[PDB]
Amino acid sequence: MEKILDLLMSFVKEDEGKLDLASFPLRNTTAGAHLLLKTENVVASGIEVSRMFLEKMGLLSKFNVEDGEYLEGTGVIGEIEGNTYKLLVAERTLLNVLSVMFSVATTTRRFAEKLKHAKIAATRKILPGLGVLQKIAVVHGGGDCVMIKDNHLKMYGSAERAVQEVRKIIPFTTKIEVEVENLEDALRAVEAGADIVMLDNLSPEEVKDISRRIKDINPNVIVEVSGGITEENVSLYDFETVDVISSSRLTLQEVFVDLSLEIQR
Amino acid sequence: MEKILDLLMSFVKEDEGKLDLASFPLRNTTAGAHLLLKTENVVASGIEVSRMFLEKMGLLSKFNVEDGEYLEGTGVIGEIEGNTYKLLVAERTLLNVLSVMFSVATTTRRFAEKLKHAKIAATRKILPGLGVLQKIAVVHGGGDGCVMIKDNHLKMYGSAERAVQEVRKIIPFTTKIEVEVENLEDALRAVEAGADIVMLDNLSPEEVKDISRRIKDINPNVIVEVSGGITEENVSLYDFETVDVISSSRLTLQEVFVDLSLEIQR
């Protein structure tokens, strides 16, 4: 949260950067503005973050909307006022934050409601620099430890060695994930003592089959399915034997929520 | 370039962040890796940036491709080696940079080869924090100072006349003023106010043919820009001789789509 403000401040700096010449002449005025939502079926997130940010920029705000609220219909979601140069210099960054977070939080909520056994989660393929805000948006959307990938396995030599090694430097309660693309590799990971097994880019039937086989040798292993699964496809992998479905389409989808800041006169 | 490495170092901090627990036990080994392109019709960018970044991380590298180059066919586009902890912690950043930039350059070239008069350009609607990199991808992609007055400014100044007057007082003589407009009335008002560039926003091809025409008739030295979420299919609908620049949010907002990986060689 000091980290998040620093981050958003750095974004203001990038947009500015030395000085915002178009706004500079207005440094000696104040202005009020309406924050407008123009996209019609949507879940709000970034409100608390936005509020804190505006406060650090020296702007007053009120929002008529909360984080994780579902929004039927467009309108004014907030008002902002204060020094004019500050308001104009904060505009771009505020609207990115709210666009990204609303978008992610929205996708996420729709996935969630298409599932009845498995919980939806994000991948770690996030957009650099702002993955930290996308994660928060996912939690708002209604979603919610160590990862061992292929490159790790090649160096360690085996799942067994990798899990032994990592186990020596974490608490008994921290869980270890191993990523796999086939049955045999899923089974070695299980034997290796992995706590979570991630099935990469396999078909629904393959997953039906492998998830079943994992649960048969140890039903305490957590099975995660991960890929570019679309909202249309996601209930396909929703077997009783899958605990978590992660989809890159939560954080890599094109921003689609439309927001503006419109100065009142 | 110092600023770009700092930025990239910040992306590694985010990924690490305090310590990469899965790679920690491998930190007294070394490793070599192939950088893999798995998508077929593509222009490369981020190479020089990646090179410098890997160097800053302490990793040796080789690249068999350059910024600007068009690439048919998948393959190994480079090789990396050095301390295993450092390689593995560099991985995801490296591949975001490269996947982001390749994607923006690739699209940029596609847009560029559809136009004969106007030049393609990015807008200011960029992914925050990685704009510097996207703008570079755009250059590499083919396409390619000034000050922008938008609607919130004009509401405060009261008029374009006043807005141009005021901003003229605090910029060099070589610096151009852009005014953003959405109809004919406001477009001529901006020309009349002294604007050096007029950006035409959210308007149809015929509305743009007519307005850009009138602006060039009034003063042919005014530069005309067209902006919006214009697609690759639609983009030549705006390639009138009276339009100097077309900028599209497609360049920088589109989902990332060039598939790359880093594969340790054992």
Side-chain angles (χ1 to χ4, degrees), chain A residues 27-115 117-124 126-134 136-260:
Chain A
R27 81 201 109 103
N28 293 307
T29 57
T30 64
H34 286 183
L35 187 64
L36 295 180
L37 166 69
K38 278 152 174 186
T39 305
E40 208 201 71
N41 279 290
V42 128
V43 36
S45 71
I47 303 306
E48 172 187 315
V49 167
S50 286
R51 180 189 283 117
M52 285 181 127
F53 161 63
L54 293 165
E55 201 160 64
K56 191 144 199 205
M57 294 285 317
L59 307 161
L60 297 65
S61 62
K62 95 174 152 205
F63 291 82
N64 48 250
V65 133
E66 312 183 25
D67 286 315
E69 200 183 330
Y70 183 68
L71 300 176
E72 296 179 342
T74 55
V76 177
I77 63 163
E79 297 180 52
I80 298 177
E81 97 81 51
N83 179 264
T84 298
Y85 172 88
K86 285 154 164 186
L87 181 63
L88 294 175
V89 142
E91 174 170 12
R92 205 167 285 278
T93 289
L94 172 78
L95 297 172
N96 289 305
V97 161
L98 292 179
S99 271
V100 175
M101 293 195 264
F102 270 60
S103 287
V104 165
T106 306
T107 301
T108 293
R109 176 147 309 184
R110 287 203 300 249
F111 277 65
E113 285 195 65
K114 277 202 176 297
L115 305 173
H117 309 134
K119 300 301 194 190
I120 187 80
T123 67
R124 52 272 102 70
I126 59 207
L127 285 160
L130 47 65
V132 190
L133 300 183
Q134 288 185 313
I136 288 158
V138 171
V139 166
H140 294 317
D144 197 24
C145 78
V146 191
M147 178 61 82
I148 291 169
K149 323 207 78 205
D150 207 54
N151 285 338
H152 295 105
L153 294 160
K154 270 152 161 173
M155 294 310 299
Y156 284 113
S158 56
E160 189 202 57
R161 186 52 174 279
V163 170
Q164 261 184 350
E165 231 87 303
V166 175
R167 204 61 96 187
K168 291 169 176 165
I169 65 178
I170 62 185
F172 195 85
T173 60
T174 286
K175 289 182 169 285
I176 292 160
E177 279 220 49
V178 174
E179 291 204 15
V180 299
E181 290 152 338
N182 58 66
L183 175 51
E184 165 66 21
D185 285 335
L187 294 184
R188 276 264 227 343
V190 169
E191 287 191 320
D195 305 300
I196 308 166
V197 170
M198 201 223 282
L199 310 171
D200 259 319
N201 282 116
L202 278 138
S203 80
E205 35 104 54
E206 289 177 307
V207 162
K208 176 160 179 164
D209 174 56
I210 294 155
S211 69
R212 185 72 273 193
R213 284 208 154 88
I214 290 164
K215 294 300 192 170
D216 278 3
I217 46 162
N218 185 348
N220 306 321
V221 177
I222 287 163
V223 181
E224 169 168 14
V225 170
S226 200
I229 303 166
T230 69
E231 190 201 334
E232 295 88 12
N233 288 340
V234 74
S235 63
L236 292 187
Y237 304 91
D238 196 26
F239 308 107
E240 328 144 351
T241 58
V242 170
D243 302 300
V244 180
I245 292 183
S246 64
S247 173
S248 69
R249 306 320 309 285
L250 270 45
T251 46
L252 266 41
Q253 204 206 338
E254 171 199 344
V255 179
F256 67 95
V257 182
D258 183 26
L259 291 140
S260 37

Side-chain angles (χ1 to χ4, degrees), chain A residues 14 22 151 156 254 261 263, chain B residues 22 129 152 157 250 255 262 264:
Chain A
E14 160 202 18
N151 285 338
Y156 284 113
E254 171 199 344
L261 191 62
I263 282 193
Chain B
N152 283 330
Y157 286 107
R250 270 32 279 286
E255 185 176 18
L262 185 66
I264 286 188

Side-chain angles (χ1 to χ4, degrees), chain B residues 135-165:
Chain B
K135 296 270 198 199
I136 293 160
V138 170
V139 171
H140 292 328
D144 180 25
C146 57
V147 164
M148 171 65 68
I149 304 179
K150 343 173 87 288
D151 199 52
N152 283 330
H153 297 103
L154 297 159
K155 280 166 163 174
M156 292 308 305
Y157 286 107
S159 77
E161 188 195 343
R162 182 76 128 121
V164 177
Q165 260 166 30

Side-chain angles (χ1 to χ4, degrees), chain B residues 2 4-14:
Chain B
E2 21 63 48
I4 285 158
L5 296 171
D6 293 344
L7 170 79
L8 292 192
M9 281 319 113
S10 83
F11 297 156
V12 175
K13 241 76 182 301
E14 182 208 28

